């Protein structure tokens, strides 16, 4: 009689059919990615349009249920997540235009090539060379040439395509009752109908602005220190009060400052923690690394992995006969099947990456009992954060000493810990302003606050204002340099990394408080603490059937993002950095540019 029970029955049938269909599709993906052939690609296409056709058919079948007449929250969220029609509500001609634009611009990003001005037949792709050209070579001219050539080759092509893409996304947003595509992407963090746990769409912007305001002292101190180090490095390129150049930041767009650790190491004579020598000395392999991760996870009370994972998953490079793409990825095929695929090498970085991947597996198996629509994290930002917190815990020298990878005679001191905190800051503190800047610029172009003819000017002005980076070569509006990034150029959100950075350290603080550990947080370990494991599981189990604020309170007791854990973590580095910065200017001047003399 009522409509909620009809929706319940429809969801009951949808879960059963979609389980088998998604299992088939994901198994096809696993067999294609492990064994690169052409018939595997064909099976991928077959499963892909089969799954997409099932999705569109189910949406067009269940759209007729009005959301206003359901009281059970779980089925409400199920029907809300299913009822999102995506690009289908738009006209078919514009939908095909949008997908053609996506395909063309993705191909432009993936196959973009730049040739040196001395050999027309010698050209380099972005992946397997341009990154290295500027992430290993210290020459200013080569980095400048690579940056300029890449941007001039990609942005000029991608400018009108990105304009049409943005326009189509605005029509898409207004079609389904959102003001802008930025609002559509912000819609991930929305929950309604739960008292004491609601969240608005502008609340996210307000909170991220407040958090960035609270964090900016650390960024500016690190910026001053890095500028001083680069002054000691490159004496004739940057003003001691101006912004850093774009092509002197380590990676393609200045996303991470991990590369500059070698140039900006405070104490280059202290040894660095590397268990690769202990890796090769004890004849460790991939199976022993994953057993070590298994025992680390069982130490807190989490269950060990299933037999199928240790029987069928590929834990090593499949030789040279068969090629495979082995980026670290955790696969949830469904029906109780879990898999990992990554070319394992005997390195410490592969140890931490394996810990991260099995943390992903643990998170994914945590909500295996939840329905098909709800087998995902409370939002997008919990998966990778939970993966990274495990690597952070395992990177502690105390755990390595306990598991016998470092000799107990190793002497921990202030210098080594300062170096560790500085490299962690270069990896983490550097990316927060850039992610905030990029996502805010995307919001503000989507909302229409900026006319077309000054996108790049405003982009660079606000960058030299907040992120302290000034271009070495002046650029016109013919460029689409934002589309030079994988995330911008393939339709992904980017505030996810800032949210993850907040979440992972908030979780680390909460678990360390639950672990009864004394001292600095970087030394904190959570092993041999079943209380930490049960606290982790208490949020692991829900999935996303409940508001993300409730899931966050389940582990930390707070209903919103806060920046106290990050500053508490980096306080020793805070005081060391402010002690160093007494004789150096703090801040940056927006007027100075390398091209202006």
């Amino acid at each position: 009689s009522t409509i909620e029970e009809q929706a319940k029955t429809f969801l009951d049938k949808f879960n059963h059919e979609a389980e088998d269909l998604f299992y088939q599709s994901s198994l096809a993906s696993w067999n294609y990615n492990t064994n690169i052939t052409e018939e595997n690609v064909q099976n991928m296409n077959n499963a892909g349009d089969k799954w997409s056709a099932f999705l569109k058919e189910q949406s067009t079948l269940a759209q007729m249920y009005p959301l206003q007449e359901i009281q059970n929250l779980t089925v409400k969220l199920q029907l809300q997540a299913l009822q999102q029609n995506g690009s289908s509500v738009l006209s078919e001609d514009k939908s095909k235009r949008l997908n053609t634009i996506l395909n063309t611009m993705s191909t432009i990003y993936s196959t973009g090539k730049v040739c040196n001005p001395d050999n027309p037949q010698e050209c380099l792709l972005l992946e397997p060379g341009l990154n290295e050209i500027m992430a290993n070579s210290l020459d200013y001219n080569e980095r400048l040439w690579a940056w300029e050539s890449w941007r001039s080759e990609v942005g000029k092509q991608l400018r009108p395509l990105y304009e049409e893409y943005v326009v189509l996304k605005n029509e898409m947003a207004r079609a389904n009752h959102y003001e802008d595509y930025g609002d559509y992407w912000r819609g991930d963090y929305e929950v309604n109908g739960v008292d004491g746990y609601d969240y608005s769409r502008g609340q996210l912007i307000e909170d991220v602005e407040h958090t960035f305001e609270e964090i900016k002292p650390l960024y500016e101190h690190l910026h001053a220190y890095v500028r001083a180090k680069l002054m000691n490095a490159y004496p004739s390129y940057i003003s001691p009060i101006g912004c850093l150049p774009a092509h002197l930041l380590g990676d393609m767009w200045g996303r991470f400052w991990t590369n500059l650790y070698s140039l900006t190491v405070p104490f280059g004579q202290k040894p660095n923690i590397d268990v690769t020598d202990a890796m090769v000395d004890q004849a460790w392999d991939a199976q022993r690394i994953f057993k070590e991760a298994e025992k680390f996870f069982v130490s807190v009370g989490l269950p060990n992995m299933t037999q199928g994972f240790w029987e069928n998953s590929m834990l090593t490079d499949p030789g040279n006969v068969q090629k495979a793409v082995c980026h670290p990825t955790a696969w949830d095929l469904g029906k109780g099947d879990f898999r990992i695929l990554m070319c394992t090498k005997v390195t410490m970085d592969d140890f931490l990456t394996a810990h991260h991947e099995m943390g992903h597996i643990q998170y994914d198996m945590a909500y295996a009992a939840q329905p098909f629509l709800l087998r995902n994290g409370a939002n997008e930002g919990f998966h990778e954060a939970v993966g990274e917190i495990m690597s952070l815990s395992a990177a502690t020298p105390k755990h390595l000493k306990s598991i016998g990878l470092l000799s107990p005679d190793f002497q921990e001191d202030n210098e080594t810990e300062i170096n560790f905190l500085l490299k962690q800051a270069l990896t983490i503190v550097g990316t927060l302003p850039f992610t905030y800047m990029l996502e805010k610029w995307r919001w503000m172009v989507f909302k229409g606050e900026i006319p077309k003819d000054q996108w790049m000017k405003k982009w660079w002005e606000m960058k030299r204002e907040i992120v302290g980076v000034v271009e070495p070569v002046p650029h016109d509006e013919t460029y689409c340099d934002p589309a030079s990034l994988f995330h911008v150029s393939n339709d992904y959100s980017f505030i996810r990394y800032y949210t993850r950075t907040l979440y992972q350290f908030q979780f680390q603080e909460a678990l360390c408080q639950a672990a009864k550990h004394e001292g600095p947080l970087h030394k904190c370990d959570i092993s041999n603490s079943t209380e930490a494991g049960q606290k982790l599981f208490n949020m692991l189990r829900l999935g996303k059937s409940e508001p993300w604020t409730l899931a966050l309170e389940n582990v930390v007791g707070a209903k919103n993002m806060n920046v106290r854990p990050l500053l508490n973590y980096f306080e020793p580095l805070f005081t060391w950095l402010k002690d160093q910065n007494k004789n150096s200017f703090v801040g940056w001047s927006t007027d100075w540019s390398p091209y202006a003399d």
Binding site: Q6, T9, K13, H16, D20, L61, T306, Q307, G308, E311, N312, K335, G336, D337
Partner: protein
Amino acid sequence: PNCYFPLQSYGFRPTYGVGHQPYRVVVLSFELLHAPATVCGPKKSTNL
């Protein structure tokens, strides 16, 4: 649209989890009622 075929399939493959593994089950049922008993276990003795 609301009327479905009430039979499903037990998709079985040798790379499945133990909880989902295809266990084999047979149930044995007895009856303790007053009636001429035809079946019960054997027993043997020693030597003369």
